[PDB]
Every structure is written in C-alpha cells, then in structure tokens.
Design a protein around this ligand. Structure first.
Ligand code: 6VU
Ligand code: NAG
Length: 332
C-alpha cells in the first residue's frame, strides 16, 4: 500500500514506554507496551478474579461490551522473564494507530501483583515473529501486513529521553526522530529480533562477549540486560554494588563511569554514563541505579543480551520484516 501510521507513546520515568490501542466495538482503550521481545497480544480481562489486585488497578477488556467479539477460549500462559500472565484467547477488532485489524489476543485472567502492580501499562502488543507466538497465534504486525496498507513491511521505534514520550511508525520510519544513515544488521535467523554481538567493552577493554554472543533488540524491556555471569563481570568492572533487583553506584561516581560499547554489525554502539546511569543526585551518600541488570533467558532464545529502552533511547531502531534486519540510526 501507501500508508504509514504512527502510535504516540508515553514515557513513564524512562522505564516504561507505552501507547494506546482500542479493542472491540465500541473501542475499549488500553495502554500497551509494543514489545519486539514477544509475539502475543494481551490485555487484562473482565474475567480476571479481583483477588488479582493488578486487575483491580488496570483496565479490563469486557467482551460482553463488544459487539465485534468472537469467542475462542483456548487457555494460554505467557511466561516472560519478569513474570507470567495467563488467561484465554479471544478475537476482536483492534485499532492501532488508526489501522483496524481483526486480531486474536489474550484475555488475561491471572495477573500477579508482582510485577504487574508496577506496570503503568495494561497489556502488551508483541511485535515479534509468529515463530515466538504462544499458541502460534498470528501476531498483529503480520495481520497488518496481510491487509496490504503499509508502504513497507517495517516498523520503527523512537523512545524519547524526556519523561512526546515516543513514537512507533508502522510502515516506515520518521526522519524527524533520527539523523544520519541507518546501519542495517541482519538477524541471526528469522523468528526473533536477535542479532550477533561480537564484544561488550568497558572503556577500551573488550572484557565480555569476546567469542561472540547474542543480542535481542527488545523494545519491551526497560534496560540493557545480559546473563547473571556476564552482568556480574560488567558490574565488577564498573565498581557497582549488586542489590536485589538492580545495580547501583554512589551517585557522585556516576559521571566517572566509563563508556560501555556493544560491537554490533562491525560497529561500536557506545553508551556513556549519561545514557545508563539514573543520575538522580551527585551525593556520595545516595545510590544511583544503573539501567543495566541481569536477565537470564533460557534457550533457545538465550543466554542472550537484550538491548532495551536504555539502548533504543540513543539508537532509533527500524525493524525490517521484508529483509530480516534491524536498522539503527542516531536518535534525536
Ligand atoms: C519499554 O517500556 C516497557 C518496559 C516494560 C518492562 N517490564 C517487563 C519486561 O521487561 N518485559 C515484559 C513486559 C512487556 C510485560 C519484557 C518484554 N520483552 C520480552 C521479555 C521476555 O520475556 N523475554 C524472554 C524471551 O526472550 C525475549 C526476552 C520481557 N516486565 C514488566 C513488568 C512490570 C513492569 C514493567 C515490566
Ligand atoms: C480457537 O482457535 C483455534 C485455532 O484457530 C480453532 O481451531 C478452535 O476451533 C477455536 N476454538 C473455538 C472454541 O472457537
């Protein structure tokens, strides 16, 4: 086709970027993360027991208020690295950036308070491949492609550093939010937004991923992550202290921290301390969190690094389904 369309995103505290979709007739609105690290659509269900407090606080899809609903009822569980939701499949019309698509999605009936009470978003729109889709449910971008409306089989992510929170372009990219040329890196394989990485360096020292490793480009993740052993080494190099869920440095040390570079497609993608430290103070008596942590992702996807919002804030990212590649450009 000829259409480009966009979804405007909100940036909650540089950690959660979400847009709004409509589901049903008339449209029920949900806040959703657009997640290249997964392939299912879900939102919380009116069938969710209210003993799940996360279903009390989030927007619930009520099938009984939608005239375009089509029951399916197959039960599915989506296991994320951060937690699990379960429920059942339904079909309805989803509106996303003014594109209406008939989509099979999860109605979540089991939604654990940890972590989902910490989600500003209600649900997830998986932007990954059908190969990753639980229940082999056709992902929404595949269904959008099938309509022949988009000028290209691509979508692009801008995540703002100011917390316009962000923008996803369906069918292209937005030159207003990047500059210079795209650097295009081929996927290891179709089915996952994962590329080869050939080094993680602290300063001039390539102390990790020397023999090569994987990098998942995960728009649904807040941080940069790697395996526990990888991240422990990295954090030992930075002089960072491990806590339960994050690593920290004394805030005064934040600006002294070295650059971290990811060797992707023959180039060094470099984050400075400003890109990865939540510099909330300059006090030697406060602790400042790093936007880098351990996520152990089991095979076949992992072990793998994952380049989340921390990375994407700096690097405008085009996801190219036509050519099975990811393009990076400098975000502005
Ligand atoms: C950039 O803005 C969105 C940041 C959301 C970060 N966040 C995650 C989170 O990081 N994820 C899930 C979620 C999308 C459901 C990621 C999304 N990408 C897929 C990964 C994942 O499960 N894997 C395992 C399989 O391989 C790919 C990475 C989980 N869980 C959360 C719970 C409460 C609050 C915030 C949470
Ligand atoms: C749910 O979807 C599957 C796959 O399309 C289909 O075979 C099945 O019959 C559906 N079930 C119901 C109850 O509609």
């Amino acid at each position: 086709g000829n259409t480009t369309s966009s979804v405007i995103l909100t940036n909650y505290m540089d950690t959660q970027y979400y847009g709004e979709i409509g589901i049903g007739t008339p449209p029920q609105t949900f806040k959703v993360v657009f997640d290249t690290g997964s392939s299912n659509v879900w939102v919380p269900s009116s069938k969710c027991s209210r003993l799940y407090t996360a279903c009390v606080y989030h927007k619930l899809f009520d099938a009984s208020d939608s005239s375009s609903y089509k029951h399916n009822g197959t039960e599915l569980t989506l296991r994320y690295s951060t937690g699990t939701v379960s429920g059942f499949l339904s079909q309805d019309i989803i509106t996303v950036g003014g594109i209406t698509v008939t989509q099979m999605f999860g109605e979540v009936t089991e939604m654990p308070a940890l972590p989902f009470m910490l989600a500003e978003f209600d649900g997830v729109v998986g932007m990954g491949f059908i190969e990753q889709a639980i229940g082999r449910v056709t992902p929404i971008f595949d269904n959008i492609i099938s309509q022949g409306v988009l000028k290209e089989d691509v979508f692009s992510f801008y995540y703002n550093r100011d917390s316009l929170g962000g923008q996803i372009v369906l069918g292209g990219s937005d030159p207003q939010h990047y500059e210079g040329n795209f650097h295009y890196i081929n996927l290891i394989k179709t089915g996952v937004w994962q590329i080869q990485m050939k080094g993680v360096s602290v300063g001039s020292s390539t102390l990790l991923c020397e023999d090569g490793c994987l990098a998942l480009v995960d728009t649904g993740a807040s941080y940069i992550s790697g395996s526990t052993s990888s991240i422990e080494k990295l954090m030992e190099a930075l002089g960072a202290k491990k806590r339960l869920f994050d690593y920290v440095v004394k805030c005064n040390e934040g600006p002294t921290l070295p650059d971290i570079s990811f060797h992707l497609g023959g180039k060094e993608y470099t984050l400075t301390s400003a890109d990865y430290v939540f510099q909330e103070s300059y006090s030697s008596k406060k602790l400042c969190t790093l936007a880098i942590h351990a996520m152990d992702i089991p095979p076949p996807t992992g072990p793998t690094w994952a380049l989340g919002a921390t990375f994407i804030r700096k690097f405008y990212t085009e996801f190219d389904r036509r050519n099975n590649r990811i393009g990076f450009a400098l975000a502005r």
